[PDB]
Write a structure and sequence with these properties.
Elements: E1 18-24, E2 29-35, H1 48-55
Antiparallel strand pairs: 1-2
PDB class: hydrolase
Keywords: hydrolase inhibitor, hydrolase
Assembly: monomeric
Length: about 60
């Protein structure tokens, strides 16, 4: 599983409220979170299906 999949979600400094997905490795689930629109990290997906394919494990 890529190492960036183990990071907590990162909202960042932007003032937007954009609903994105992160992979929660401890839970084993893709979950939603509020992203501010600036300086996303890689554990920040546009969909659940993308989060799971990238971070869900082989």
């Amino acid at each position: 599983r890529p190492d960036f999949c183990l990071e907590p979600p990162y909202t960042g400094p932007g003032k937007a409220r954009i609903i994105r997905y992160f992979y929660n490795a401890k839970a084993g689930l893709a979950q939603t979170f509020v992203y501010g629109g600036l300086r996303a990290k890689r554990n920040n997906f546009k969909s659940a299906e993308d989060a799971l394919r990238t971070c869900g494990g082989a």
